[PDB]
Amino acid sequence: VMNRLILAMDLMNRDDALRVTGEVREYIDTVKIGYPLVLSEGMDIIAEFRKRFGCRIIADFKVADIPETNEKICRATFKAGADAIIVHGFPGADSVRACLNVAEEMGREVFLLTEMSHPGAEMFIQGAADEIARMGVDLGVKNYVGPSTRPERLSRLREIIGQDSFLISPGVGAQGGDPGETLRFADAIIVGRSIYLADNPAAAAAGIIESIKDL
Amino acid sequence: VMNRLILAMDLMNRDDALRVTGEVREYIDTVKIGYPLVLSEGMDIIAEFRKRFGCRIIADFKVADIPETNEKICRATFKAGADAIIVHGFPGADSVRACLNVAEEMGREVFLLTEMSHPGAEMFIQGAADEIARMGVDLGVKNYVGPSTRPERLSRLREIIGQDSFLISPGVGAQGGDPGETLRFADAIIVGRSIYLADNPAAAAAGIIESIKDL
Ligand SMILES: O=c1cc(O)n([C@@H]2O[C@H](COP(=O)(O)O)[C@@H](O)[C@H]2O)c(=O)[nH]1
Numbered sequence: 001v002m003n004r005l006i007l008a009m010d011l012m013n014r015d016d017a018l019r020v021t022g023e024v025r026e027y028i029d030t031v032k033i034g035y036p037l038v039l040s041e042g043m044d045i046i047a048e049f050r051k052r053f054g055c056r057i058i059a060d061f062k063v064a065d066i067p068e069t070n071e072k073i074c075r076a077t078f079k080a081g082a083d084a085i086i087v088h089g090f091p092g093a094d095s096v097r098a099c100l101n102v103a104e105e106m107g108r109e110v111f112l113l114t115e116m117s118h119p120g121a122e123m124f125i126q127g128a129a130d131e132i133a134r135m136g137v138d139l140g141v142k143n144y145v146g147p148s149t150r151p152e153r154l155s156r157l158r159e160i161i162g163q164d165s166f167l168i169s170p171g172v173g174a175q176g177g178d179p180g181e182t183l184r185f186a187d188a189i190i191v192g193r194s195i196y197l198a199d200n201p202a203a204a205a206a207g208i209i210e211s212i213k214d215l
Numbered sequence: 216v217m218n219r220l221i222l223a224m225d226l227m228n229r230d231d232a233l234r235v236t237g238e239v240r241e242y243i244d245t246v247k248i249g250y251p252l253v254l255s256e257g258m259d260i261i262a263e264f265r266k267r268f269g270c271r272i273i274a275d276f277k278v279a280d281i282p283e284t285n286e287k288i289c290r291a292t293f294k295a296g297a298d299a300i301i302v303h304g305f306p307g308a309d310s311v312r313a314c315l316n317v318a319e320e321m322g323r324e325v326f327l328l329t330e331m332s333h334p335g336a337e338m339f340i341q342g343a344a345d346e347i348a349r350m351g352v353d354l355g356v357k358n359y360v361g362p363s364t365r366p367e368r369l370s371r372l373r374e375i376i377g378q379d380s381f382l383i384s385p386g387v388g389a390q391g392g393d394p395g396e397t398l399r400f401a402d403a404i405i406v407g408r409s410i411y412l413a414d415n416p417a418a419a420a421a422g423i424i425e426s427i428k429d430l
């Protein structure tokens with residue numbers, strides 16, 4: 001992705017989301033849109049963004065249902081124009097396979113979320129994360145999400161998925177993660193509040209890119 | 216809930232969803248609306264249903280993000296009129312607490328999803344489910360979701376949460392679960408395809424209720 005930086009656009013107002021995304025567009029080529037924005041403004045926001053900014057859109061819907069419901073969620077999401085969808089691995093292989101099947105049918109991609117970045121991830125997800133990543137490899141998953149807040153875990157996850165797999169990583173900035181250290185293992189970093197709550201989002205994005213280019 | 220039966224309305228078309236829900240309204244008082252319908256027709260469908268049918272609406276969004284994002288998802292969901300939201304417990308206590316805080320602020324309820332009903336739930340969720348339920352009890356959660364497909368697990372979950380807690384259970388019908396056996400442990404059953412794909416949804420609902428009344 002452009003500059004290895006993905007914007008997590010979690011503002012819940014279309015006008016503010018459009019303003020900030022437009023201000024930082026020269027620095028990115030991929031926007032992660034999740035439920036905070038979609039549940040506030042509608043699924044049409046995905047095609048609006050894709051068109052207005054010509055960016056790729058990753059729908060961060062942390063899909064985590066039974067296979068049959070996961071298939072429906074993925075079909076609705078790709079119909080709305082999303083390029084990729086983020087899926088939880090913890091509900092198991094059949095639930096992930098259902099998403100992979102719809103992505104294959106529709107010419108799109110699935111990102112598998114392994115370990116999460118927040119403190120509570122240590123309770124149950126962390127202990128299962130290596131196995132979730134191995135499950136991804138066995139299912140043919142090529143895109144993964146891992147935590148900026150725990151670079152030693154990001155390293156172990158990169159070890160499991162290999163160098164050919166694409167790995168993106170949230171938790172940079174507000175949650176404490178560092179751009180440069182995270183990019184030692186991930187291909188791209190996801191950044192939300194550090195950019196969208198900044199007094200000058202473009203300056204915040206530029207600052208991050210400068211520290212990345214130096215790597 | 217009326218007749219201890221909750222309709223899982225996972226049709227993706229507003230006209231079909233309204234038709235089926237209207238046909239079975241005399242047999243229920245609670246409709247579970249999830250992402251298949253919301254991502255296809257918009258969040259306004261929640262208030263439309265609540266108004267048209269005078270039913271309680273559980274938003275089955277399997278919330279499974281970091282605390283900050285979970286708070287935003289819950290606020291948007293309750294603003295749309297949902298009476299309750301279903302939250303995954305696998306992501307940990309801070310993520311669940313964020314949802315409980317918004318429900319307290321807005322006078323609504325949180326249902327904690329413990330073990331899931333599909334086969335893949337055996338891979339990672341089942342091994343953590345008793346602990347997820349105990350976490351719910353420690354956080355003060357009073358509403359839970361457990362699997363119709365594994366009544367021995369539903370029994371163990373009921374044992375952990377106590378008799379005062381409210382427990383609802385999906386996996387009845389299409390996934391193999393039985394109404395009567397499930398109601399030995401759960402307060403209400405969730406039924407989707409067995410009713411909404413039936414040639415006569417009202418007859419299917421009536422049939423289930425007749426077998427429930429006999430209990
Ligand atoms: O483990 C994970 C997975 C995520 O998708 N995310 C998501 O990435 C973004 C992080 O945003 P922020 O930079 O404001 O902390 C949010 O949209 C969040 O939902 C995360 O923070 N941790």
Ligand SMILES: O=c1cc(O)n([C@@H]2O[C@H](COP(=O)(O)O)[C@@H](O)[C@H]2O)c(=O)[nH]1
Binds near residue numbers: 066
């Ligand atoms: O463990 C769980 C948790 C759920 O919410 N569900 C949900 O309950 C419904 C089950 O519907 P059905 O009766 O068609 O199998 C679906 O909406 C599904 O997403 C489930 O099946 N298993």
